[PDB]
Amino acid sequence: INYYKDAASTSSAGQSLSMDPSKFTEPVKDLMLKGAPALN
Amino acid sequence: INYYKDAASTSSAGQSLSMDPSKFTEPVKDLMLKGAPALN
Amino acid sequence: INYYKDAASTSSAGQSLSMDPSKFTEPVKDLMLKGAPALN
Amino acid sequence: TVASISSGPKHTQKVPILTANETGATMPVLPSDSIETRTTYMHFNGSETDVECFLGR
Amino acid sequence: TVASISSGPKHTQKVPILTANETGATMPVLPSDSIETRTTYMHFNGSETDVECFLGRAACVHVTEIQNKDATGIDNHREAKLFNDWKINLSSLVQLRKKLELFTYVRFDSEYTILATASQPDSANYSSNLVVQAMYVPPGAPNPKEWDDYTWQSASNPSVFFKVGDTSRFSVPYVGLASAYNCFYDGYSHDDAETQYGITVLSHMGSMAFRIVNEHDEHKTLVKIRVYHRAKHVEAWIPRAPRALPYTSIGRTNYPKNTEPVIKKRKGDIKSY
Amino acid sequence: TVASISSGPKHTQKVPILTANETGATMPVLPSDSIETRTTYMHFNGSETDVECFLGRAACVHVTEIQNKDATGIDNHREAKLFNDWKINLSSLVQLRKKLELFTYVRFDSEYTILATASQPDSANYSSNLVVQAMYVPPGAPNPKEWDDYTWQSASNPSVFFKVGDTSRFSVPYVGLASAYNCFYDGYSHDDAETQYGITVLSHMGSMAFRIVNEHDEHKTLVKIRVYHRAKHVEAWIPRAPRALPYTSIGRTNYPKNTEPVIKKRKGDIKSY
Amino acid sequence: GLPTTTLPGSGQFLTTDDRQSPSALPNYEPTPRIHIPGKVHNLLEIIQVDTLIPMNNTHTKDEVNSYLIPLNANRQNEQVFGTNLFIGDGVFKTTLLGEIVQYYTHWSGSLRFSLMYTGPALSSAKLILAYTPPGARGPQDRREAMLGTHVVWDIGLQSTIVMTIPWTSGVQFRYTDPDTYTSAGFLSCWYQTSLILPPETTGQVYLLSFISACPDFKLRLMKDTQTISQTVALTE
Amino acid sequence: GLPTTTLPGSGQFLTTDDRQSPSALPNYEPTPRIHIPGKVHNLLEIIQVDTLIPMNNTH
Amino acid sequence: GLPTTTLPGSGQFLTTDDRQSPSALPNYEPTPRIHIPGKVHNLLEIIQVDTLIPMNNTH
Amino acid sequence: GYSDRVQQITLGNSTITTQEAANAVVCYAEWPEYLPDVDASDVNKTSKPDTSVCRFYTLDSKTWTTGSKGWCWKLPDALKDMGVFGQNMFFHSLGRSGYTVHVQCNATKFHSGCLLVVVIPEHQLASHEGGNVSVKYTFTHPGERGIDLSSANEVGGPVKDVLYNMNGTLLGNLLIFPHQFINLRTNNTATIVIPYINSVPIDSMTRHNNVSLMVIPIAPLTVPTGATPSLPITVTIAPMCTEFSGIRSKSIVPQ
Ligand SMILES: Cc1cc(CCCCCOc2ccc(C3=NCCO3)cc2)on1
Ligand SMILES: Cc1cc(CCCCCOc2ccc(C3=NCCO3)cc2)on1
């Protein structure tokens, strides 16, 4: 129950439960498959 | 939920969301169209 | 919502909205019509 | 609720303003019995003159 | 909502930017009438510029002070600040005043908050909790004369009792006699030759009176009252030019003589940046 | 969810453990690519590492102090701590700072808690409950000059009044001018040759000002204000390397000269355990 | 009895909170509303009405004359006036727009700047108005000025010209109190050809200038105005 | 335990507010009402009865 | 008036609790979000990127 | 061939023609109308003299010269003596009215000058004394003569400083009030229709003026060479939808 009118006044947000490290761990242009050779 | 009986005791009103500047910006008797000459 | 068991403990009563001055303003035995003569 | 109704000139045999106070009544005479009036509404209920309100603070 | 639409080159006989200001209108010209624009959206509603919002926060409207001390031998309680009052009015403190006078007539319910804090100037001991009584005294009511008169019985007059250090809060419906409160009034109370001119004649909303309920201790205690006012359910008509010169009086428009130029003089030419 | 799957002997032409790190990727290698594993489940969600959780607890962001004393003959209230202010900022205290600067841009609503406690250094008597007023003074607002200026009327500026010893709490929406707050800014406010460099130019969010509402008692009272800040509704972009050296200034990245080696030297060889 | 816990902030008074309160006057009936022309709902409604700018600020005490921008007959190539666009300060500051902007911390949007010509009907003139977006200096000559937002105004039957300063900005809000990072540009005006008076006529002619906000405009984060202060409470 | 916040005005006594209170005499039974002529409901009922004006105030 | 009882812990400030608060800036409209590459949601996302180890610590 | 430019207003037994108008303003976009019952309070039937009061009265003329500061008239005061409008005014307890205001000033295509014609609802004047000095009655009831802002301060009178609108606000912002300019080069008249604006349904016509009409030179008058250096300005005003109520003995007002 929100007792207040504005959105800033609500409690903390709830877990992204998004999670996708590939923008950080695999930003390569041509896709690399694990097990296939790195450099062909 | 109002806890009180009288109307003065309720919280602030809620946004007019009315908004019509023409009583102030265009109080002319004969309607002016933008693009048409001001004085004919 | 009454939180208490006894009737004395409830808040103020609410407007009679009864209003009938005739017991005070016209307690005459034979009915008087405005416009007709007072004493016939 | 109307506070006053519209009323115009009168030339009658029916005079609501002559009474006999000896009777003990207060006859319910209104502005419109003796002048020409226009309609107006009450806009009011008499809420704050209820005896519950009068003795209730 | 679009804030700007896309618009391209123009070579017309239809010129929206030439107008005649003598007419009194402000023609609704937009960026896209005179340059080439791209679409953009507003992303905004204008929520916080609603008059309910503009006049709806608490503003300090009055600071007064009363003291708790032995009234023994005081010939004039009112004068000893044994209790004090306030000739209700909203124009005495001038921050909120400039805001309201942007409009001619205004209608609203009031929510009052009253903060009361105590001060003990003369080196002291134990302060026993003081309870303030604020009572509303409308026009034609027995004004109180001592700090403990029959008046304070307040059997028909709303009064609130709260503790110094705390705050009291309650809300009063729009008590104006007309349909709106006049922020301005170019009239008199009657056609006399010497009667006051202004609103003060119009805005006699009675005074508010404060006192401490406690009897006196051995030391003296200064209690300073601050009244805050918040408009709720606001309705405002007829905008006016904002106040430029300083204020001199509650209820008159008068400005001080040999005031200073209110428009900042350029350091340079008309041509200067 | 499985944390590890079961995997057995391998004799392949398909080697997941040989990669080329020059590419910039971190290939997702697992225990089961190089030893024989058994199934096991995660039993865990990673709840408490969510950025909302990481930045979502109150941190002390500021400690200031004001005193209640007779202002009689004080030529500079600000200077007597008759009231004081704070040039709002979140980078002054450095525990919360290292946490935020793990990201480049951050967007969130703030919840402030303000604790105020009193101290009476000079042997004293009865302390009358002091009420603090915190008022937000945004850029381009009449800065206050005495501890009881018209400014404190605060008719349009949000202010909170609470008691010393208590706490005040309220929450302010994300007030940034852009889409996010810059944790870093490699720019200037304009292309001048001597204008400051950093964020300080970007992060001028105005100051907050505190005062005691009470007049003075016979003794003096020190009130020390602690502001706590909790981010709610957090959004963070572009992770960066954590801060290694100590901080020297609000808003610049500068580290102190002749600082000490931050990597612990081995007591022994490279070969040591 | 229901169990409760009180949180931090209990008992505080925040002048901006909005809650219910007991009415001191239970059951009172307010006066009926009657109709009054002119109701205002948003300050955004009124900042679109244009008002005069004391552009000619060069005087030494406030005078009707600082509203008048003078024009000289027969000058060529030269500059009529210049100003930066800090709407919360300087020329703009006393105008209704300037005056309202000052109740808020941030503004964004387009401005409408118009000039109404007041010279004899038998005279003629061509002026150029130029808006210079942030990043360059106030233009120093028309050549410089004409490379940015500009309108050649031809003085005619139609007496006023409405120039718009379209919102040109990286950051989506600027500060109303003048700030660098957040600065908006310059506005200048020059003779395009030149003012020419008819025979039997002489002297200076003046332009009146107005400012109002486009429907585009946004103002946010209310605060207190530097435009009004006081030293003791007023009395009756 | 449900989390609450108290507002300004807590603890005040406003002589005009209208709320519930515990009864000091739990379970007590008031005397029955009997009929009495003359009940008044509004002060507006009675100000319509006319009364004499001391017009000749000169004494 | 509804009867209440306050529990132990009333009035405490726990830096880790998560509740509602009044907004100081009623009705204010925040700047629109635009898109920015790189959003992080969990610290678990970033500790999977490898970084260099100063293994040769002997200096 | 209708132009914004030519106009005819016929009201009662009087007609005005202008061949050089600049549209007309209707305050707050509302046209004068009678008092509806739903808004009524006084129970009295009102009197609506119609055509005998709703006609055009031309006040005495003013003279714009290079030194003029501006003039100010109050309504209904300015008309307190015009024909039956005025009689009705002194004879009823309450009255109500809207007006058509037509300000006239013609010159030639060699003159320059520009007047602001503005209507200010509830124009409460300031005392030039400062403090809380009041402005006596007579001073705010100049009658058809109006107030001449270039006249000298008098005692008990209002301040007459133009950059401050006679009340502590700047001349430049008067444009927020219904107004129209007369720019010799464009315009030769200004016309404003004023609906009745008050916080009560009907009021006293003598103790309270509800609008001040103000004509202020802003771009100074500049006449052609060796022309006479001045032009007359004439103000003609017509009550419209007038209603009077509460008839009796006939008010006696100061001075
Ligand atoms: C214009 C304008 C508007 C106002 C405000 C009018 C408010 C009505 C009267 O105000 C009060 C104040 C206090 C109390 C009160 N009752 C118990 C304690 O205080 C009641 C009404 O004043 N001028
Ligand atoms: C990066 C970064 C983020 C922040 C925090 C910005 C917070 C916005 C402004 O903060 C306040 C603080 C106090 C108040 C306040 N109003 C009434 C009392 O305190 C309002 C806004 O600072 N730097």
Swiss-Prot record, chain D:
It is found in: Virion; Host cytoplasm. Transmembrane segments: none annotated. Coiled coil: none annotated. Signal peptide: none annotated. Forms an icosahedral capsid of pseudo T=3 symmetry with capsid proteins VP2 and VP3. The capsid is 300 Angstroms in diameter, composed of 60 copies of each capsid protein and enclosing the viral positive strand RNA genome. Capsid protein VP1 mainly forms the vertices of the capsid. Capsid protein VP1 interacts with host ICAM1 to provide virion attachment to target host cells. This attachment induces virion internalization. Tyrosine kinases are probably involved in the entry process. After binding to its receptor, the capsid undergoes conformational changes. Interacts with capsid protein VP0, and capsid protein VP3 to form heterotrimeric protomers. Five protomers subsequently associate to form pentamers which serve as building blocks for the capsid. Interacts with capsid protein VP2, capsid protein VP3 and capsid protein VP4 following cleavage of capsid protein VP0. Interacts with host ICAM1. This is Capsid protein VP1. It comes from Human rhinovirus 14 (HRV-14).
Curated annotation (Swiss-Prot), chain G:
It is found in: Virion; Host cytoplasm. Transmembrane segments: none annotated. Forms an icosahedral capsid of pseudo T=3 symmetry with capsid proteins VP2 and VP3. The capsid is 300 Angstroms in diameter, composed of 60 copies of each capsid protein and enclosing the viral positive strand RNA genome. Interacts with capsid protein VP0 and capsid protein VP1 to form heterotrimeric protomers. Five protomers subsequently associate to form pentamers which serve as building blocks for the capsid. Interacts with capsid protein VP4 in the mature capsid. Interacts with protein 2C; this interaction may be important for virion morphogenesis. This is Capsid protein VP3. It comes from Human rhinovirus 14 (HRV-14). The lineage of its organism: Viruses, Riboviria, Orthornavirae, Pisuviricota, Pisoniviricetes.
